[PDB]
Amino acid sequence: MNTIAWLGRLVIERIRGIGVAALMLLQIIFSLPSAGGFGRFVYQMHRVGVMSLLIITVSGLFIGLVLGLQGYSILVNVGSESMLGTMVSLTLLRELAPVVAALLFAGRAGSALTAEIGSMKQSEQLASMEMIGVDPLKQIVSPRLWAGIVSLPMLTVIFAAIGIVGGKLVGVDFLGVDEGSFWSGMQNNVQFGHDVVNGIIKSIVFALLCTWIAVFQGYACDPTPEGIATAMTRTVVYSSLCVLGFDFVLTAVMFGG
Amino acid sequence: MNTIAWLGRLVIERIRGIGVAALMLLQIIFSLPSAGGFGRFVYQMHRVGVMSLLIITVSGLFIGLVLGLQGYSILVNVGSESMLGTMVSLTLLRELAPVVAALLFAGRAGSALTAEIGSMKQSEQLASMEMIGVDPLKQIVSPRLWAGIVSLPMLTVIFAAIGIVGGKLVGVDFLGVDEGSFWSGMQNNVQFGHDVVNGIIKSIVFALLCTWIAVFQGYACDPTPEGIATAMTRTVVYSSLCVLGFDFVLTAVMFGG
Amino acid sequence: LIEVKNLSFNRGERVIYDNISLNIRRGQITAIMGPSGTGKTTLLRLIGGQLVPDQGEVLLDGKDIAQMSRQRARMGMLFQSGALFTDMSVYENVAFPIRAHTLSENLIAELVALKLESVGLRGTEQLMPTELSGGMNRRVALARAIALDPDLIMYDEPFAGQDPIVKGVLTRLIRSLREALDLTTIIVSHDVPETLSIADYIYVVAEGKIQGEGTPEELQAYASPFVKQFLTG
Amino acid sequence: LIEVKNLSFNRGERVIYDNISLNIRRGQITAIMGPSGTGKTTLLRLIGGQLVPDQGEVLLDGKDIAQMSRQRARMGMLFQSGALFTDMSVYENVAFPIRAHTLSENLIAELVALKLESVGLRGTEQLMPTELSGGMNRRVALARAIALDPDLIMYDEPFAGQDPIVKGVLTRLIRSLREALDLTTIIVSHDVPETLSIADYIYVVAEGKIQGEGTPEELQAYASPFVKQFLTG
Amino acid sequence: AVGIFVIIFGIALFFLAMKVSGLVGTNLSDGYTMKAQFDNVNGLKPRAKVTMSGVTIGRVD
Amino acid sequence: VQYLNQELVVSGKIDFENAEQQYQAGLAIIKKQTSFPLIVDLKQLEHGNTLALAVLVQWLRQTPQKSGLHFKNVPEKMLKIIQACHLQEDLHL
Amino acid sequence: VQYLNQELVVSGKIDFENAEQQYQAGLAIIKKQTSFPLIVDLKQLEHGNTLALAVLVQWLRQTPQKSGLHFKNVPEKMLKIIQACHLQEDLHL
């Protein structure tokens, strides 16, 4: 597992100006830990949560149906000892699905968050409030950071979980795959209670990545619309390698590949 | 193969990304879409081409290497019945890479496109030019629909091609496999050189789908900062899972699956 | 010659104008006043021929110009931004929207150099809006409006994107230039002082209908309680 | 009591202020205006303590406030928009920033609810600045301006870029609200009525240092080629 | 750059933390190297497993 | 005005002369029968006038005989107006 | 002015930068170097005046017997002004 660690050193590499917000992320409960359903707080929860419920069900049908034909063709090509969900649900729940989930959360909702924060400096809150001296960290970080990271690592796992729950629906409709053998097969193939329990940790680390990357670029953007799209370009560059560095390391360590 | 048409209808089920300005797209087809190396072409190929050049070389390599770790773990577990590139290039070129490539255009370049048109409706171009009567469709959409099928679907094949280039980089580093036996062993198993050259058609329709959705959100926005940021969050709702209608339709024909 | 009769406009769900009228003739310099955000921009779009009104007529010498272009109809206006692309040169900026109606590169080649002598920016045709100052950009935009010799030239808050202090200098300049031009002029501005010294007749909109119809001296004196509160002493 | 002596600041590579000075009493209208890139809002940040000045002293009642905080020195100001929280409600606009600066449970419980009724904002408590009009937002802004009673009070373009109607209302309204004190006021603004009727002394800063110095009558008569063209007859 | 771009300097010292475990160890000096002659092997692979009493002890160099 | 007891405020037309008249009207009507819904809020005023001085003296005559009275949360400029009437020495403040 | 070649006439309003600068240059340079052909776009000007036509009357005596002459796209406002003093009957326009 040394070559894996060699390739998995990308988690340190993509930290350009991000590291300035070190004590900025610390002091977000300094000036009174607020909580509740608020106007923007809930809209970020729609972007991360409510809308993503439909994304999860339909992208699960895109993945599921593609790997459902693969399952059939493995029977035809390789054989009966790795057929159907013996060697497909094995790779799908465990190592494959997690990457796409991170791209549709850390990528998609992370940049969306940034885009909204950028406009506080340009127009609605921070423009007037930093100048006065109304605590900047309490102003835009504290009530927007928490909104997009509480359900996020559960949702990252749910992405993959629904590929198994909906995988037996289309395992039956494409062929007739028994639901209980799919279920008991799944458990045994990945040793779920020790390996997939640790894949939950892998997805918490993915939530923790959103707390470093997204905040700084919204915090100090240039208040022009082109500077905002440059800031969203930067978050795609930052989040694309940080996730892959952990796809190397934690697949080998949390899952045990 | 009953999953050929089932992937298609998922895209068809919900079409609200195109529908509202479909009549304007039909008018461009009516009036005859423009072509030529213009200033619009330069910035369209900046977002699609120039930006993606460094993304594909760097992140695109490590994406492939994470899918090659999956390849390696099969060698560790199964070995001899799925050796070298039996089960590695097989799903990589044909099934896995295509979706991630779409997230760099339907997702990233699409978001950028939205951002540009929305802001020119508020400032540089269409704010004044609609009122002047220099035909808006002919001005900024008509030549950039044509631009979408020039470089973009080749780049999806190049993205995938980098996975194969990365496969021989670490054939020795994960274990000690001679690059020439890995690649020629791979070549024979999937009939690589014939199918990968024939499969350049898969994502041409996807290029068109990316630009039919993304242009709408910029084009018919309310040009205020609240209306424009809402439309950018609406871009990834519709463009993310409506670009995969023709996966197995042309994988079976061009990639020879 | 633009004839306006009983013009009524509903902007989507918001009713803007209840049948209005005017007497703006060929070469007449007038102004139209009202609060910002009451469809003053969309009024100018109706006069040009971009938007479609519900009731009433807007005719060009008793003709409906739905199938004709604005360049062939001899209409135009000066904008808040100036209608200049930022990735193209000044030459290209003012050549972009005059391609329709007498397409000729040699005509444009002579036009751009000559028409900028009136503002004193003859050698700026290779520069871009970023390189130029704000005042220079407005001076090029003025010359753009008179490119194809249009009859109609409307003014929609020319100096909206400039600072109040900067506008003070440019308003003094443009005052004499509008009188020298002497074409069909419709001034829309949030500054009242600007319109008092230039316009002959002023059309004051009072709650979605033109009520004040007269000269600066006749409307010094106030038409209605609304107008009394519109311009304070 | 605000006293500034020989304040100079270079913002990166761009020189903004070359030793300037002023004397402004508590609760009076402040404003710096001019072309973009001359520090309209930079003075506000230097006195507030967001940017670090190079040379000079800023005193609050003859006390150095360079190392003191906003809460410790009791500083604040009113912004052009209104200095309100856009996401929050009108109740929450004045309930959020009263926790900082003299934290007290009886302060929050009693004053916040009652001061809104004393202005006339009882039926707008649950509404947000986006929903309200500019005039309604100004009423909340005026209530917020003296909510904390800062020792150091500044303003920023009270009614420079307002609607035709609203500007007329705020010219008399805000003047009469500041007339209660009527102390040494220094305004640099485009609006002539504003600098004539309210301000006592004028210190125009342009191209680095103070170029215009005196009363409206003393500065009728001009200071520079720019001013000669800027002001009208 | 003690500001904004200092962080690039600081993370350079943690970027190579998987340099020690990037290939081997090292640990070749605590192992054994031995050689032998073979006349005909069906299926010799680089890094083929070598055992002792059913336990892998190393690989073919 | 709800029964906390909150300050008597004008529900209609808001003005300085209207609020000071309402204070004298509530003194004759409500405070005469032993009740003082009054937390004197001076935060929105910049400087007092003859009417603000007048009611401070009238309040001193009225309420103290029966109970206490809230003078909480005042700014520095209107605190000097309270000190001008000399309420600090012998009245809640 | 480029190397087309063209005459130097005032195209628009006579002002500080073209009243004597372009007038003297037409007599000294354009007449001497023989750039008699003139393509000029006059759409930016509403109507001309006596002094702008007086320059063309000086060219009236010179151009006919020396070179050719071809105008392009003259707007209909300037056709009325130039023709009125009989320059459209003898010169190309």
Short mmCIF file of C-alpha atoms in Angstrom, two decimals, chain C residues 48-50 58-60 62-70 73:
data_model
loop_
_atom_site.label_atom_id
_atom_site.label_comp_id
_atom_site.label_asym_id
_atom_site.label_seq_id
_atom_site.Cartn_x
_atom_site.Cartn_y
_atom_site.Cartn_z
CA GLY C 48 -38.88 52.03 -31.31
CA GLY C 49 -40.91 48.87 -32.03
CA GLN C 50 -39.43 46.15 -29.80
CA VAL C 58 -47.56 53.52 -32.96
CA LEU C 59 -47.18 54.28 -36.66
CA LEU C 60 -44.27 55.51 -38.78
CA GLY C 62 -49.17 55.97 -40.95
CA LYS C 63 -47.44 52.61 -41.51
CA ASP C 64 -47.02 49.49 -39.36
CA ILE C 65 -43.30 48.57 -39.27
CA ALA C 66 -43.58 45.03 -37.83
CA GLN C 67 -41.78 43.44 -40.80
CA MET C 68 -39.18 46.20 -41.23
CA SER C 69 -35.96 46.54 -39.20
CA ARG C 70 -35.00 49.50 -36.92
CA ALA C 73 -36.96 52.43 -40.10
#
